[PDB]
Amino acid sequence: MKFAEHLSAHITPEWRKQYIQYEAFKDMLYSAQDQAPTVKRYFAKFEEKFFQTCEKELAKINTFYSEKLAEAQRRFATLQNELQSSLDAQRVQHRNIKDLKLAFSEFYLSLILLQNYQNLNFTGFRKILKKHDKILETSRGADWRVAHVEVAPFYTCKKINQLISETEAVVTNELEDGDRQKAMKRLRVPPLGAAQPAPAWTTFRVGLFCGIFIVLNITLVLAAVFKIWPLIRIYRGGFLLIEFLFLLGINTYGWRQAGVNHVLIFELNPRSNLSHQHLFEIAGFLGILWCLSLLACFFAPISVIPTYVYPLALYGFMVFFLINPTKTFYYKSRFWLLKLLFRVFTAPFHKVGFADFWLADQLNSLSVILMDLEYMICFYSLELESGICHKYTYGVRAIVQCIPAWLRFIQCLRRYRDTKRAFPHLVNAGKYSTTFFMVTFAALYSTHKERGHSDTMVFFYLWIVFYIISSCYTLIWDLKMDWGLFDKNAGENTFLREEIVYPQKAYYYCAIIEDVILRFAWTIQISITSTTLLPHSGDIIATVFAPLEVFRRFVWNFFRLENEHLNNCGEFRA
Amino acid sequence: MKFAEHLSAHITPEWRKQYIQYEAFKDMLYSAQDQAPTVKRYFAKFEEKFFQTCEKELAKINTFYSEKLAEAQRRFATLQNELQSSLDAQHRNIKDLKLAFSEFYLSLILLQNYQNLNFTGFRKILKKHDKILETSRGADWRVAHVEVAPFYTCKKINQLISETEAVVTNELEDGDRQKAMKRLRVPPLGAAQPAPAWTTFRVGLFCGIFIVLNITLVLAAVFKIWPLIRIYRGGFLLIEFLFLLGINTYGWRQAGVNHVLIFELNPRSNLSHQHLFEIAGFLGILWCLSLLACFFAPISVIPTYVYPLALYGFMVFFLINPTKTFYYKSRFWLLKLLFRVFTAPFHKVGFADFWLADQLNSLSVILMDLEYMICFYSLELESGICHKYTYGVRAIVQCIPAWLRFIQCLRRYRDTKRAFPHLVNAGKYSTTFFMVTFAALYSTHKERGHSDTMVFFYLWIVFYIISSCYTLIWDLKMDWGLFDKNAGENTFLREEIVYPQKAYYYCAIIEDVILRFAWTIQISITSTTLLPHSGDIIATVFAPLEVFRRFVWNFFRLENEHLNNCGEFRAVRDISVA
Ligand SMILES: CCCCC/C=C\C/C=C\CCCCCCCC(=O)O[C@H](COC(=O)CCCCCCCCCCCCCCC)COP(=O)([O-])OCC[N+](C)(C)C
Ligand SMILES: CCCCC/C=C\C/C=C\CCCCCCCC(=O)O[C@H](COC(=O)CCCCCCCCCCCCCCC)COP(=O)([O-])OCC[N+](C)(C)C
Ligand SMILES: O=P(O)(O)O[C@@H]1[C@@H](OP(=O)(O)O)[C@H](OP(=O)(O)OP(=O)(O)O)[C@@H](OP(=O)(O)O)[C@H](OP(=O)(O)OP(=O)(O)O)[C@@H]1OP(=O)(O)O
Ligand SMILES: O=P(O)(O)O[C@@H]1[C@@H](OP(=O)(O)O)[C@H](OP(=O)(O)OP(=O)(O)O)[C@@H](OP(=O)(O)O)[C@H](OP(=O)(O)OP(=O)(O)O)[C@@H]1OP(=O)(O)O
Ligand SMILES: O=P(O)(O)O[C@@H]1[C@@H](OP(=O)(O)O)[C@H](OP(=O)(O)OP(=O)(O)O)[C@@H](OP(=O)(O)O)[C@H](OP(=O)(O)OP(=O)(O)O)[C@@H]1OP(=O)(O)O
Ligand SMILES: O=P(O)(O)O[C@@H]1[C@@H](OP(=O)(O)O)[C@H](OP(=O)(O)OP(=O)(O)O)[C@@H](OP(=O)(O)O)[C@H](OP(=O)(O)OP(=O)(O)O)[C@@H]1OP(=O)(O)O
Ligand SMILES: CC(C)CCC[C@@H](C)[C@H]1CC[C@H]2[C@@H]3CC=C4C[C@@H](O)CC[C@]4(C)[C@H]3CC[C@]12C
Ligand SMILES: CC(C)CCC[C@@H](C)[C@H]1CC[C@H]2[C@@H]3CC=C4C[C@@H](O)CC[C@]4(C)[C@H]3CC[C@]12C
Secondary structure, three states, rough: OOOHHHHHHHHOOOEEEHHHOOOHHHHHHHHHOOOOHHHHHHHHHHHHHHHHHHHHHHHHHHHHHHHHHHHHHHHHHHHHHHHHHHHHHHOOOHHHHHHHHHHHHHHHHHHHHHHHHHHHHHHHHHHHHHHHHHHOOHHHHHHHHHHOHHHHHHHHOOOHHHHHHEEEHHHHHHOOOOHHHHHHHHOOOOOOOOOOOHHHHHHHHHHHHHHHHHHHHHHHHHHHHOOOOOOOHHHHHHHHHHHHHHHHHHHHHHHHHHHOOOHHOOOOOOOOOOOOOHHHHHHHHHHHHHHHHHHHHHHHHOOOOOOOHHHHHHHHHHHHHHOOOOOOOOHHHHHHHHHHHHHHHHHHHHOOOHHHHHHHHHHHOOHHHHHHHHHHHHHHHHHOOOOOOOOOHHHHHHHHHHHHHHHHHHHHHHHHHHOHHHHHHHHHHHHHHHHHHHHHHHHHHHHHHOOOOOOOHHHHHHHHHHHHHHHHHHHHHHHHHHHOOOOOOOOOOOOOOOOOOOOOOHHHHHHHHHHHHHHHHHHHHHHHOOOOOOOOOHHHHHHHHHHHHHHHHHHHHHHHHHHHHOOOOOOOOO | HHHHHHHHHHHHHHHHHHHHOOHHHHHHHHHHHHOOOOHHHHHHHHHHHHHHHHHHHHHHHHHHHHHHHHHHHHHHHHHHHHHHHHHHOHHHHHHHHHHHHHHHHHHHHHHHHHHHHHHHHEEEEEHHHHHHHOHHHHHHHHHHHHOOOOHHOHHHHHHHHHHHHHHHHHHHOOOOOOOOOOOOOOOOHHHOOOOOHHHHHHHHHHHHHHHHHHHHHHHHHHHOOOOHHHHHHHHHHHHHHHHHHHHHHHHHHOOOOHHHHOOOOOOOOOOOOOHHHHHHHHHHHHHHHHHHHHHHHOOOOOOOHHHHHHHHHHHHHHOOOOOOOOOOOOHHEEEHHHHHOHHHHHHHOOOOHHHHHHHHHHHHHHHHHHHHHHHHHHHHHOOOOHHHHHHHHHHHHHHHHHHHHHHHHHHHHHHHHHHHHHHHHHHHHHHHHHHHHHHHHHHHHHHHHOOHHHHHHHHHHHHHHHHOOOOOHHHHHHHOOOOOOOOOOOOOOOOOOOOOHHHHHHHHHHHHHHHHHHHOOOHHHOOOOOOOOOHHHHHHHHHHHHHHHEEEEEEEHHHHHHHHHHHHHOOOOOOOOO
């Protein structure tokens, strides 16, 4: 019924510019009919111009299809050579054959993608020429389609069908022991992008969890206004995790809408990947659990059950929700996340891909959870001078604060060793080491504040200068090296890059301003939380700023993924 | 992919028997493949049997297609005659003719979809046979017979469709093709149309808020001047009825019961079950908020009694909102149906009017609560004067829905002139009048020294038994069409059942048996003062049960009505223009 929306929803992002400009053709036809008042001569001239544009688009489609055909043939030849080599070779062999199977599946997916490209282009050409015929009341569009479009190489080439059949047969005969069902179970390509909406049950569950979360938040606010353990420092981590999951669902939705191929960037399975709806569902469920635990703490209806059981259990459930061996709840994604976390926490011993660095950055923005965990350990170790945990600073607190920065710094060092490109990796390593310097100097100042060493005023100046250095370093890296903004090629996009996938420039400008403000706020919050510093209002400031840090990292995720998709800023791809 | 499910979802329900039996062919293919051990000759014999079955299916499909095409041509001829008559006459007539033309176009599109689906199924099943048998003879059979069958080689339907579009856009749309193809487009129909994502999200959000608010209300009641039960029972029953009606719509869609045709709704624009669910969720959210405000009374200045009224007022406004928003089409249709029902004698009784009258019969508790709240406001504002004593107006208001159904049955008898069904139904509704009147007489005479109260008590018990038996028998035999003599396998049922499980039918029968007596007891208790102590609690408990019973009854009555259309192969409405 409507081909503009169906097409745009089915466009392959990386090939967006190579499809027929159906919307442009619509605008051209509508404008031509709008200016219609000699008159027949003008109509004939418009017809000639329209069909010249059609020929140009058809030629573009043909050249793109020919290039993709050559690429697919080369890929098939390479895959056959690899299969022969693996067969000659036959733990390591199993991994090799699995990688070969994955490569064959990816190549088949590419063939399906280009077949869909061909079908969509032909359908768009036919529909636009039908619209031309209907608007201009002429039977010449069909003649033009039959004369050239019907005989165009892109529509008359069946090499892709033969390649698909050959790939299927080869996989079935040399990778699945002659079973076609198993081969097609992995080769089949379901609808991609936004073509397949999320299940109705998933959306209903997301809505149910959102409603329960909203009502429970209202109830919590009412209980707090009306109505032994620090509840803020125990529940801030959970609240931040829920907020991060919700903002990550928003990030995934925006990436899908803007054509940012985060599936390829994150190296996820394109045939089956988690969507924003599932992230919203998980965030809503975790928020429901968090709200229930906090309400139980506020009320404690059961006396036999101590209050401290409620927080622990909540966070225990969360742990049990992530390390569950059973294949019940997002098991594929949960196992992938577990592997990524293991790689990140063992950063120097694994090659650093985009996913590892991205998760390490997320942890950098989520250090408050580790700080709260360490504070809970301190509370259970000593407090259970009364408030000794938050009144003094120790090295363990500083190293716990710097753990995410340490992980990122070691990742950058490993990347430098692997690639030897000193500039980016070492500049990023220094950016992360500014965090170590700032935290150490803040801890020294806090320790010296208690005793009159006479060298506490000099430790404060060092902390101020290193705070400024770290803030400027992080902001510059975020604006220039992460988002790729402030580029010379952006003639029409001031303070941006040449190409921006997102619709509005206001998004980018507000992002720059918010990045600066919340970078300063994040540095301040890290300074406050790492050490005693403000002994009275520090906790409130940290609690207020941590959600702002999560929001800043969410916007940063948006723009970092955008830059990575447009330009290989992270150099994680060939 | 998954062509069996696609065929099941896209088949026209009334033509279910007339499609290619894809699942049956799959069964034959799988059974033959498993039975494979002389092997080649056995395979050839199975292939011959499969081709014979395919030939039978092709002949049946061709015959059905020819019959439907002939019906379409006759309908087009009649429509052209009506158009000529209208031209000779030359607003309501033009609108009715436009509706008839749109319905004919819908029927043509349905027949074309039937043809395309049958051909695609024939191709898919023959491809499956080729794959399983490792032979290409099925493709040859498809080419020789399926691709040359009259049902697939006849493009007369496309020409008829084009002629219909031209006629509509010329003689009705004033030579505009934009107004045409908007009245007659036939978007995806049946269960093949997914509901909007935002609608599902709103349904979920409303359900979650409703659940949490209900939990809060229960906690407040268990841990923390105006009868709240009477005030809010009507609203709770309305919310429950809306939720169960959404369930009814979902089940009708899944089972293929074409409620759209039975209710005479527009096939192109239908209210999905999720829309009903979200409406019920929002109404329940408002009801829970009002109840919580009554309980806690957060605003001291605002009196408690304002909270319910407002809610109900909003509810009324929600139904009365003249603005073209918030299901304005469905709301206006419901308002017209209600106006027809409450003025039954002066309007022709369709299925929708009788169905809504029955729904109101199951929802008499709302009217009773309204009357009680009128009495309380008039008199109370002798403690409990309204509750302790009853009057004739109470019984009359109780019998109102039964009066509506009885007069509808009388009108149906007057129109059709058939005396069995309509007058037996009228007697079954008059039993309610007798029972209510005798209950009221006994309750009135209990307080006074009539000296014949026991006689009226015995009369009330006799007529209560009579009414319960009458309603139960009518529900089981007439409404649900069960206990039919032609039931071969489905004992105590009819020959053909649209729902997957007969256990559902048996459980529904038992539940109706119990709940008809429960509903009669509830009506007796509410209408009079038989049980002044526990009567209110009994009525409150029974009213949701009455709504559940009228939900199950809706299921089975709609199934029974749809089976008649299935037998008649009537997939579209019969439009008459005056
Ligand atoms: C400081 C303390 C800890 C801080 C928090 C730690 C971790 C959470 C952070 C990020 C989660 C991953 C975000 C994915 C981003 C990429 C885009 C995308 O959406 O990708 C998703 C990946 O889904 C995920 O990874 C899971 C999403 C998160 C679910 C949360 C589970 C519960 C966690 C409990 C918290 C644990 C600590 C206890 C509390 C103290 C695509 O899924 P797929 O199925 O295509 O996956 C690929 C699978 N193949 C390749 C085999 C097909
Ligand atoms: C004693 C009090 C009685 C309580 C009220 C009981 C029932 C009213 C609701 C529904 C009855 C009709 C249902 C028909 C069955 C098929 C399912 C379906 O609903 O399908 C619908 C038909 O139904 C409806 O439109 C029902 C409308 C529902 C709107 C909600 C209004 C609620 C108002 C609340 C009242 C407040 C009272 C409180 C004061 C005490 C099909 O949708 P369409 O878009 O094809 O509609 C047709 C529209 N064309 C003709 C243009 C295509
Ligand atoms: O509205 P009408 O009745 O006057 O004519 C409509 C009709 O064109 P027709 O006369 O056959 O040439 C549709 O064809 P159809 O789906 O049946 O298909 P096929 O016959 O199978 O090809 C077409 O859909 P589409 O197929 O191009 O998506 C639609 O385009 P529209 O919504 O604008 O959407 P856009 O594509 O421009 O975004 C036209 O609407 P209008 O142009 O607004 O008036
Ligand atoms: O992703 P992979 O292909 O690299 O690895 C697959 C492999 O196991 P691994 O993780 O390598 O240790 C399969 O068995 P395997 O070792 O005999 O290997 P082969 O496929 O013969 O090479 C296993 O099938 P199973 O026995 O559980 O059913 C499957 O599990 P699971 O997700 O539940 O998926 P399902 O199979 O249930 O769909 C894994 O994922 P996927 O194939 O993508 O699905
Ligand atoms: O590869 P497989 O074996 O897993 O699936 C095959 C077959 O299933 P099988 O195993 O024989 O039982 C078909 O029926 P099915 O299982 O979905 O149906 P049920 O619902 O159970 O009836 C399936 O869909 P479909 O033809 O019915 O729509 C079709 O897929 P696909 O490429 O989309 O074919 P096309 O639609 O584009 O023609 C494949 O046909 P082959 O070309 O012969 O390989
Ligand atoms: O569609 P019909 O032709 O069968 O009936 C339409 C007709 O109502 P009638 O019976 O004559 O009283 C229109 O009034 P009219 O004669 O002044 O003018 P027109 O020449 O038709 O424009 C009315 O306003 P309008 O929408 O068209 O401007 C429109 O409302 P509806 O679409 O609901 O509302 P919205 O689209 O605004 O939300 C009705 O659409 P139906 O939904 O199908 O009933
Ligand atoms: C108050 C100010 C400082 C905060 C910074 C502005 C916020 C509101 C801006 C910064 C980046 C923006 C996002 C950037 C990209 C997208 C993807 C798009 O498909 C939908 C909108 C969405 C999701 C934007 C929403 C608004 C947003 C979050
Ligand atoms: C009270 C005791 C004796 C019996 C209770 C039986 C209830 C649970 C039975 C009676 C009628 C049944 C319904 C009959 C028809 C359908 C439609 C189907 O597509 C889904 C199930 C559904 C919705 C059934 C669910 C179960 C049901 C509601």
